[PDB]
Ligand binder design. Structure first.
Ligand code: CLR
Length: 551
């Protein structure tokens, strides 16, 4: 009945150490002393309390006005805060009286490992699933947050709400995936306790399961989250370089005051410069590519259009360079039909701005268009677009704004040009007015989609996307570091424990670093705290101020 510390005597055949019959390992990490146990427990308490309180307040803010705040692209972070709140409560459970022994220790006083098991209680499993599910549920929402930001740039020039029909689709995948992982861990009975952290978690006894079920899934969400974030940056940077100020009023390289004179006066000036007489002007600018922009379609349409008697009533201009055969084809038509201008050089932005604001119609014969930002500048300048019904550009152009055609059909395109002539013989003022109003608006007029309203889902969302990414990257690094060195610490732990009995000095080769543990906790709690600032604005204070006035 004798066992030497750190081992204790028990009658459980499942608690005995490798060959030491009757003796198992006490429920106290032998590689750390009491003083640093109290330090770590105090450290956890501070972050847990702060995360719980601040996260709960944000959740209270959303439900205070759920009828108006329940808007899909702006409530992704609400579920993120919900996930982290549950995780925080899971961590804080250990600070109830006697909780650590009931959670970490077996009834015989030995360390819990290999849970679940029918011979012990459910306290270790309950804490494990709460914390682990909360962790994985949160980071799965994070990749949804970045994806929403990536697609939120489609909410310009249209009324269509992206992902409006996919809200339940995300939810089912978001909650199902962490549930599957949780069940997989329980199926292999790898839930182990640790007095240092104060909770049960994966793979303390075997590093391989901790790498598989924690490190690996966290790595994948970082890859996906980074991918969408990178594309979002390219979109946002591309906007500011080319069309900055595509925002609440209008202020860019375009402005109403930059161009002078009437529409006809500028048209006559440009046509004089090109040696052309008055007519209905159709303009296209773009790269002379194949399969991406229909330059071949546009050029072929002119050949078909050349047979009509109305051909002499219209004026054309093509700007761009690229494949030399398209360039030769365009120049040949220029000489064959002396009513079209061909430009292959680099054209200044100043010239383009005046050209866009003078030409009657702009042609966009694309084969693919991401979401149609290139068509918005022409609409801002009063041009009436004719475009292929491809990509996300179909959501911008409507019957009262322009003409859509099937891609690849030069005959249909020519018919659309003939339709443009029918409109051009009448008053086009309504079409130009609709083009400007639509391009600088969206249908989310809950509070006047202006710079104080729509920047929420373009700029503010972007900040939190990268902010969450940073903390999750730190968490990945901590687990990555431990995984590299866990194998040696296991060997050290084995060697250290054996010499303790002294059955006639022991030394610790190495151990897990408490500093890495603190940083990992900081990043985990930091994400919950960081995402709790979404509602830190003046408007929410007013809501709370009036909410308190229910009294
Ligand atoms: C490597 C990537 C994923 C990191 C995250 C992307 C970073 C670089 C992006 C995402 C969000 C972006 C910011 C979003 C907010 C604004 C406000 C805007 O008025 C000016 C640009 C500015 C300041 C952006 C600068 C670049 C930014 C911080």
């Amino acid at each position: 009945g004798q066992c030497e510390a750190p081992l204790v005597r028990t009658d459980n055949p499942k608690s005995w150490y490798e060959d030491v019959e009757g003796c198992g390992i006490q429920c106290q990490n032998p590689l750390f002393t009491e003083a640093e146990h109290q330090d770590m427990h105090s450290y956890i308490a501070a972050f847990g309390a702060v995360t719980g309180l601040c996260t709960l307040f944000t959740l209270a803010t959303f439900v205070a006005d759920w009828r108006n705040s329940n808007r899909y692209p702006a409530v992704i972070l609400f579920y993120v805060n919900a996930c982290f709140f549950v995780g925080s409560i899971g961590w804080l459970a250990q600070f109830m009286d006697g909780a650590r022994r009931e959670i970490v220790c077996r009834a015989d006083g030995t360390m819990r490992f290999g849970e679940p098991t029918s011979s012990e209680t459910l306290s270790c499993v309950i804490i494990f699933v709460i914390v682990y599910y909360a962790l994985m549920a949160g980071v799965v929402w994070f990749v949804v947050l970045t994806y929403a930001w990536h697609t939120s740039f489609k909410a310009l020039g249209t009324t269509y709400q992206p992902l409006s029909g996919k809200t339940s689709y995300f939810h089912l995948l978001t909650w199902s995936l962490p549930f599957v992982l949780t069940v997989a861990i329980l199926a292999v009975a790898q839930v182990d306790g640790d007095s240092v952290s104060g909770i049960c978690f994966v793979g303390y006894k075997n590093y391989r399961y901790r790498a598989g079920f924690v490190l690996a899934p966290i790595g994948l969400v970082l890859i996906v989250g980074g991918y969408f974030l990178i594309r979002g940056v390219m979109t946002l940077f591309s906007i500011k370089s080319n069309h900055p100020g595509l925002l609440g009023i209008d202020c860019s390289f375009w402005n109403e005051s930059y161009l002078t004179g009437s529409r006809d006066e500028r048209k006559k000036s440009l046509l004089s410069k090109f040696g052309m007489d008055e007519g209905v002007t159709f303009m296209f600018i773009g790269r002379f590519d194949r399969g991406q922009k229909g330059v071949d379609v546009l050029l072929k349409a002119i050949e078909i259009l050349s047979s009509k008697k109305e051909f002499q009533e219209m004026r054309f201009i093509i700007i761009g360079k690229g494949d030399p055969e398209l360039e030769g084809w365009a120049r040949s038509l220029e000489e064959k039909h002396g009513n079209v201008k061909v430009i292959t050089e680099m054209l200044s932005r100043e010239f383009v701005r005046e050209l866009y604001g003078s030409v009657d119609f702009v042609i966009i014969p694309s084969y693919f268009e991401p979401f149609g930002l290139v068509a918005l500048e022409a609409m801002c300048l009063g041009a009436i677009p004719i475009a292929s019904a491809v990509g996300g550009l179909r959501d911008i152009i409507t019957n009262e704004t322009g003409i859509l055609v099937k891609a690849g059909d030069p005959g249909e395109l020519a018919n659309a040009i003939l339709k443009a002539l029918e409109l051009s013989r009448s008053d086009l003022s309504k079409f130009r007015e609709n083009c400007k109003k639509r391009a600088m608006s969206f249908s989310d007029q809950a509070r006047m989609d202006i710079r104080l309203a729509k920047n929420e889902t373009m700029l503010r969302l972007g900040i939190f996307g990268f902010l969450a990414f940073g903390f999750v990257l730190i968490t990945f690094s901590c687990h990555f570091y431990d995984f590299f060195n866990q194998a040696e610490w296991e060997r050290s732990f084995r060697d250290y424990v054996l010499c303790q009995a002294n059955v006639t000095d022991c030394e610790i080769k190495n151990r897990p670093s408490l500093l890495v543990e603190k940083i990992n906790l900081f990043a985990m709690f930091g994400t919950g705290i960081a995402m709790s600032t979404w509602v830190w604005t003046k408007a929410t204070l007013l809501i709370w101020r009036r909410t308190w006035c229910r009294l």
